[PDB]
Scaffold this active site. Structure first.
Site, mmCIF file in Angstrom:
data_model
loop_
_atom_site.group_PDB
_atom_site.id
_atom_site.type_symbol
_atom_site.label_atom_id
_atom_site.label_comp_id
_atom_site.label_asym_id
_atom_site.label_seq_id
_atom_site.Cartn_x
_atom_site.Cartn_y
_atom_site.Cartn_z
ATOM 1 C CD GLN D 122 0.819 -16.576 -7.973
ATOM 2 O OE1 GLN D 122 2.288 -15.988 -7.589
ATOM 3 N NE2 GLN D 122 0.493 -16.010 -8.969
ATOM 4 C CB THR D 150 -2.734 -15.630 -10.152
ATOM 5 O OG1 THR D 150 -2.427 -15.970 -9.036
ATOM 6 C CG2 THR D 150 -3.507 -14.405 -10.089
ATOM 7 C CE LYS D 202 -5.259 -14.780 -4.916
ATOM 8 N NZ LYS D 202 -4.980 -13.432 -5.450
ATOM 9 C CG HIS D 226 -5.279 -9.746 -7.982
ATOM 10 N ND1 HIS D 226 -4.928 -10.843 -8.671
ATOM 11 C CD2 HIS D 226 -4.127 -9.042 -7.611
ATOM 12 C CE1 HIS D 226 -3.386 -11.097 -8.888
ATOM 13 N NE2 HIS D 226 -2.946 -9.767 -8.168
ATOM 14 N NE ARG D 229 -1.902 -5.149 -5.628
ATOM 15 C CZ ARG D 229 -0.965 -4.142 -5.003
ATOM 16 N NH1 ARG D 229 -1.257 -3.406 -4.201
ATOM 17 N NH2 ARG D 229 0.281 -4.263 -5.437
ATOM 18 C CG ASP D 257 -8.754 -12.920 -1.949
ATOM 19 O OD1 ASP D 257 -9.392 -12.182 -2.619
ATOM 20 O OD2 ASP D 257 -7.526 -13.368 -2.302
ATOM 21 N N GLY D 258 -10.219 -10.586 0.139
ATOM 22 C CA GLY D 258 -10.254 -9.023 -0.280
ATOM 23 C C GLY D 258 -10.930 -8.634 1.051
ATOM 24 N N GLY D 259 -10.181 -7.923 1.745
ATOM 25 C CA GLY D 259 -10.694 -7.151 2.941
ATOM 26 C C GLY D 259 -10.793 -7.824 4.230
ATOM 27 N N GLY D 280 -4.215 -11.332 2.834
ATOM 28 C CA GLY D 280 -2.854 -10.595 2.184
ATOM 29 C C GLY D 280 -2.139 -9.335 2.907
HETATM 30 C C1 LIG Z 1 1.387 -6.091 -2.614
HETATM 31 C C2 LIG Z 1 0.395 -6.992 -3.141
HETATM 32 C C3 LIG Z 1 1.091 -8.025 -4.031
HETATM 33 C C4 LIG Z 1 0.180 -9.329 -4.565
HETATM 34 N N1 LIG Z 1 0.848 -10.162 -5.327
HETATM 35 C C5 LIG Z 1 0.026 -11.178 -5.890
HETATM 36 C C6 LIG Z 1 0.598 -12.263 -6.594
HETATM 37 O O1 LIG Z 1 1.815 -12.268 -6.756
HETATM 38 N N2 LIG Z 1 -0.011 -13.403 -6.997
HETATM 39 C C7 LIG Z 1 -1.563 -13.423 -6.802
HETATM 40 O O2 LIG Z 1 -2.087 -14.203 -7.479
HETATM 41 N N3 LIG Z 1 -2.148 -12.327 -5.945
HETATM 42 C C8 LIG Z 1 -1.310 -11.080 -5.610
HETATM 43 N N4 LIG Z 1 -1.658 -10.255 -4.733
HETATM 44 C C9 LIG Z 1 -3.369 -10.586 -4.320
HETATM 45 C C10 LIG Z 1 -3.567 -11.257 -3.180
HETATM 46 O O3 LIG Z 1 -3.241 -12.426 -3.342
HETATM 47 C C11 LIG Z 1 -4.933 -11.179 -2.365
HETATM 48 O O4 LIG Z 1 -5.776 -11.534 -3.464
HETATM 49 C C12 LIG Z 1 -5.452 -9.874 -2.070
HETATM 50 O O5 LIG Z 1 -4.253 -9.030 -1.430
HETATM 51 C C13 LIG Z 1 -6.559 -10.264 -1.004
HETATM 52 O O6 LIG Z 1 -6.788 -8.989 -0.522
HETATM 53 P P1 LIG Z 1 -6.403 -8.329 1.061
HETATM 54 O O7 LIG Z 1 -4.841 -7.626 0.586
HETATM 55 O O8 LIG Z 1 -7.225 -7.472 1.330
HETATM 56 O O9 LIG Z 1 -6.490 -9.412 2.343
HETATM 57 C C14 LIG Z 1 -1.080 -9.430 -4.003
HETATM 58 C C15 LIG Z 1 -1.620 -8.384 -3.306
HETATM 59 C C16 LIG Z 1 -1.054 -7.339 -2.648
HETATM 60 C C17 LIG Z 1 -1.292 -6.379 -1.859
HETATM 61 O O1 LIG Z 2 -0.257 -9.332 -8.318
HETATM 62 C C1 LIG Z 2 -0.277 -8.307 -7.917
HETATM 63 O O2 LIG Z 2 -1.073 -7.505 -7.619
HETATM 64 C C2 LIG Z 2 1.353 -7.888 -7.434
HETATM 65 C C3 LIG Z 2 2.282 -7.708 -8.407
HETATM 66 C C4 LIG Z 2 3.149 -6.644 -8.208
HETATM 67 C C5 LIG Z 2 4.019 -6.373 -8.937
HETATM 68 C C6 LIG Z 2 4.566 -7.390 -10.065
HETATM 69 C C7 LIG Z 2 3.637 -8.391 -10.280
HETATM 70 C C8 LIG Z 2 2.550 -8.504 -9.493
#
Ligand SMILES: Cc1cc2nc3c(=O)[nH]c(=O)nc-3n(C[C@H](O)[C@H](O)[C@H](O)COP(=O)(O)O)c2cc1C
Ligand SMILES: O=C(O)Cc1ccccc1
Ligand SMILES: Cc1cc2nc3c(=O)[nH]c(=O)nc-3n(C[C@H](O)[C@H](O)[C@H](O)COP(=O)(O)O)c2cc1C
Ligand SMILES: Cc1cc2nc3c(=O)[nH]c(=O)nc-3n(C[C@H](O)[C@H](O)[C@H](O)COP(=O)(O)O)c2cc1C
Ligand SMILES: Cc1cc2nc3c(=O)[nH]c(=O)nc-3n(C[C@H](O)[C@H](O)[C@H](O)COP(=O)(O)O)c2cc1C
Ligand SMILES: O=C(O)Cc1ccccc1
Ligand SMILES: O=C(O)Cc1ccccc1
Ligand SMILES: O=C(O)Cc1ccccc1
Lengths: 330, 330, 330, 330
Positions: D122, D150, D202, D226, D229, D257-259, D280
């Site tokens: 990623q 991303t 993504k 995401h 988030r 993704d998501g859930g 995730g």
């Molecule tokens: C703690 C945390 C950190 C994440 N960091 C990244 C990241 O560095 N890059 C990214 O593209 N997505 C990031 N994501 C998003 C996940 O790749 C994904 O889209 C999301 O968690 C999917 O949903 P789910 O957690 O409900 O399965 C992060 C998610 C969480 C919860």
């Molecule tokens: O991509 C995300 O939601 C997670 C993330 C957490 C802290 C710093 C960068 C990315």
């Protein structure tokens, strides 16, 4: 109401057995959706029609039934009461309701059929095409009048209540018909070729599977998600029913099950186009609570509720109830 | 608000009587849906119109009414207060609202009509076409100005609160008009042939029954599920109202009831096309709480709420309110 | 978040004043629906666009504003803090947000306008066409840049919290502009003929009233149900907004209010087609909690939330945000 | 179930770290909507098909995967367990599931890739086009088989749990790949020109962004908000998925993704047209609870749940599952 009985059964049954009965697969999404879906359906009643001779009777698979309802197949009924299937079957006979004898009955199918009444037989496809067809032949020789071929169980759904409970059949409950493999359309054909009884496919939800069932020579289907016990996330049968009835366009009987808990619910299913319903869990609540007389009282309450609902809706016959319109609420 | 009165009535009435009043049939699905359905309706108000002469008056069945509302038929009003129907009827007269005298009134219809005002008479079809028509003739001779023929009660719905309560009429409440059978379209014709008063069919929910009512010579209908007391699962009247108004296309007055609890709710019913509404339970809360002066205060609050709502919506007349548009929410 | 401020204001304000601020009319159906409606709206964000120069600025009614937002008219702001309107107006000026001076301001309009910034003036139509037009002329002479003519208040809605509280203006709060009648389209014309400022009609919900406002020479409208304080059951403005924007097809600015509580909510309103939003209650929470610096902090948080939301959605400008699509959820 | 693991992780993790993991942006509307949206989807299963050789395998981006699933990128996995990314990556390899190595991994990407399996990488776009492309080249040299660019993070969303917690990276967690700027379509092109690996974008939610991704030479997209988030109020990916799949009409792989919290949820995503899903948070719950063996057990449970769901729905392959129909419930 049928709600009275549920608490009575909760009081008497061991927790793990009440859970075997109540539970669904997965997160129980389909189990809950069966009820939600019925609750969203509203009937548009008709007024000022002749109700001098209201009848709840229907003809189905060659025979008169007192209500548009049959007792669903529920395995291992001695789990709920010592008389098990015999108590249910006697009450059903006395009420004029068909009783579905299970492949996994805890009393032999020949003993259950000897009770009399209008027994049907539910088939699970065995390992061996020959043993499956033997079971069918036994049922037919015993006087069963339809084969209810369960088609939604290539294997059993993951029942997390049972897994959590470490639930297993007590040693005093057995599969009395014995001393399994996934069904296919080829298995349906083998059954249809080996019996003159109507073959009813239980657990159809897709429209093209309903049409194919007709093409395959089924005499009926039961639109069903197996009481929310098979695929978690399967649509409720009541949500597919109208579409399925329109697609078969009279080519087989179309039954429905899942969550039917009152005469009003029967009316709703009828108004959506069902020929009849199956009722599962409530019959077992009544069995658990009060044995044979429990199931008789349940069936009498349903009978009275179905007549009441029909007449309040202006329907002197089940056919008229099928012509009622509905509206979805929120 | 009308919510104030409900608690006051709960405090004063014996529990079983409060339940007779509040309850519905079955699981109370239709009772709850009456309110849900109103709550989902939003009005699209108009602005900047002339409101110098806002009037809530309507002409209905030959006569001016002060509001687009009448008191619904509610049997046995002495259950709620010792003055019963006389207290309600006096308040209604003084408010300029029609009062519906019941077939099962606990004071004779001739005594109620003597109060004056704009009485209507509600008919339940009796056993004997001759006694039914006598009751109609009595009502007409007493000065009633419309016959409200209840058509949704071939028999009474199963009121599980009453059954559970073992509720029965106190010995000090009687059907004062006396010293029943299902109605049909033939019964409507017999009534229509025997009176010059407008015949209003109460409890119509299907569009084709509304059209047939017009064809049958009804001067109005009340789109109603009987306050959720008849078929449990019957659609709320408010959900069928718009479709019914379009279908009759001015051929009779179209009233609605079920859950009307404020002037805003009256406005909603009007905007959906209703000529007027009936109000049932709230009138009995006011009666229970404070007798005649209770019902007068309720009717004054409704009057003020209806005027307020109309003007806030840019409507100087009820006709203008009927031309408001609505939007369904969630 | 703006949720922080609401509790802070609940702690400091006398209960009856917090209720005057929070409450709606009737059963508060429209008050709650303002929030529900926003919560159902989801934005479909765009990705990978140039965000090197993201700006939240808009031009409206002749002038640049820092955000697509103005402070809604809220009467009697000394109710919430001793500096009242002056504190809010100073914060608004410093944030580059238009401030709406009320007809019922608790500090005179000339004093508020002297603060500077981009003041607008909200008009309630008086008794006398001549006094109404005097108020307009005062506002214009003081440097106000738009007249926000409130058109949804032929009279005040029934605020049951206030009635229950027996709430009345403290003796230390007065209508400082003084030493009322329903508006009509004729009143709009009289205003439009007597000022060169843009006339903005606040409280439009019907599509044909929006079109008529354009025809009448309005320079804008505010699609609004008055924060749920006028007709109880009036549709939320956010539910009519898209239809209204399509109907005026660029002929006037179309603002919206009701429940805007975050930058994401501003983005939603923008994506539905709004030129800008008004924000009412949150500004008063910030005023109550921390006076001028409270409102400044609120406006800074909103500014940051709007920029954040825009960029996350791929919008470098408010115009781009108006071209976002949305999807309704449940 | 995956619900078991969530509580286990809540027990072991410091509160602020559990919140970093669980939280979303804003009011968490999009976080909650991810689950709501899945819960509303019902599958219409097919019956009586051959299930003798049910396989959950798919080919994606050149390689066989054991399930239609990959581990989502989650930054800083040493936050959850001391072995961090190495534990997850080993479990993923052993399960035959692709593991997404993050730009912000707490173990260097070369160490993670040395674990073996099917690593993807990623990318977050850096300040400097040259450093971004170096990171890509590192990943490719280490044997990563796809670049997951991303595209929904021009900057980070406002995580109010973190802000409230004053949460910051512990001193013992670092961005191990190091010793950022918003991406645009030009950045995508620079990546695509510099690698022969499939580029997967993504965080796509708009249909025209999906089509443009194909036009831009992406080998896939991940339809995603995401995990709730980023923009609070962004539509869930599952709600856009069907429309997006129809729009690309086979031109790239479409992941979602998501859930996703069960095999049934994977089936739902498949039936809506997804090639595969990312998971995730559940992977991090399993990591927190039991390290490598925790993630292995999670992946085994998912594998079993996906096979179960597929077969119950009559699907011998993931392609067949993509041809399932669905119905939305309430
Ligand atoms: C703690 C945390 C950190 C994440 N960091 C990244 C990241 O560095 N890059 C990214 O593209 N997505 C990031 N994501 C998003 C996940 O790749 C994904 O889209 C999301 O968690 C999917 O949903 P789910 O957690 O409900 O399965 C992060 C998610 C969480 C919860
Ligand atoms: O991509 C995300 O939601 C997670 C993330 C957490 C802290 C710093 C960068 C990315
Ligand atoms: C305890 C239990 C056992 C069951 N056993 C069988 C079975 O052996 N064969 C079958 O086809 N269906 C079986 N079913 C499903 C029922 O036939 C029926 O589809 C379902 O219970 C209907 O839903 P209801 O219980 O909500 O009325 C069983 C159901 C339950 C609750
Ligand atoms: C206690 C009670 C008694 C009633 N009796 C009659 C009756 O004798 N005749 C009739 O046509 N309707 C009867 N109704 C129904 C009302 O006329 C009316 O349809 C219903 O109450 C309207 O709903 P509301 O109570 O929600 O306003 C009765 C209702 C109640 C609650
Ligand atoms: C306490 C209070 C007083 C108000 N006074 C006025 C007024 O004098 N003129 C007016 O046009 N709107 C008035 N409004 C309505 C606001 O301008 C605005 O439409 C509404 O508050 C927007 O909703 P919001 O508070 O949810 O942001 C008032 C609102 C409140 C809460
Ligand atoms: O068909 C079902 O849901 C019930 C069942 C329970 C135990 C074993 C086989 C079948
Ligand atoms: O019509 C009704 O719901 C009320 C009623 C109560 C008791 C007897 C007859 C009618
Ligand atoms: O416009 C409103 O809702 C607020 C208001 C409060 C008190 C008096 C006039 C106006």
């Amino acid at each position: 109401s049928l709600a009275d009985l549920e608490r009575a059964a909760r009081d008497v049954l061991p927790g793990e057995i009440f859970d075997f009965l109540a539970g669904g697969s997965g997160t129980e999404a389909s189990l809950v959706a069966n009820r939600t879906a019925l609750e969203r359906v509203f009937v548009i009643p008709r007024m000022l029609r002749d109700l001098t001779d209201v009848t709840t009777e229907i003809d189905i698979f060659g025979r008169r039934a007192a209500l548009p309802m049959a007792v669903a197949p529920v395995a291992y009924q001695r789990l709920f009461h010592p008389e098990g299937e015999l108590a249910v079957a006697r009450a059903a006979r006395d009420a004029g309701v068909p009783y579905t004898i299970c492949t996994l009955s805890s009393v032999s199918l020949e003993e259950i059929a000897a009770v009399g009444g209008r027994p049907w037989f539910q088939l699970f496809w065995l390992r061996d095409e020959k043993r499956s067809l033997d079971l069918v032949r036994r049922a037919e020789d015993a006087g069963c009048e339809a084969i209810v071929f369960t088609v939604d169980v290539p294997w059993m759904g993951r029942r997390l209540r049972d897994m959590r409970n470490g639930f297993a059949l007590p040693e005093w409950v057995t599969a009395a018909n014995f001393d399994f493999a996934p069904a296919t359309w080829e298995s349906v054909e083998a059954v249809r070729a080996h019996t003159d009884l109507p073959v009813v496919l239980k657990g159809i939800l897709a429209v093209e599977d309903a049409r194919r069932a007709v093409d395959a020579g089924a005499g009926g289907i039961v639109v069903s998600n197996h009481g929310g016990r098979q695929l978690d996330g399967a649509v409720p049968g009541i949500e597919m029913l109208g579409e399925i009835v329109a697609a078969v366009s009279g080519g087989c009987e179309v039954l429905v099950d899942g969550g039917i808990r009152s005469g009003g619910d029967v009316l709703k299913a009828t108004a959506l186009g069902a020929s009849a319903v199956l009722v599962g869990r409530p019959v077992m609540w009544a069995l658990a609570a009060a044995g044979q007389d429990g199931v008789r009282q349940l069936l009498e309450l349903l009978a009275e509720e179905v007549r009441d609902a029909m007449g309040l809706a202006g329907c002197e016959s089940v056919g008229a109830a099928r012509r009622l319109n509905t509206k979805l609420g929120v």
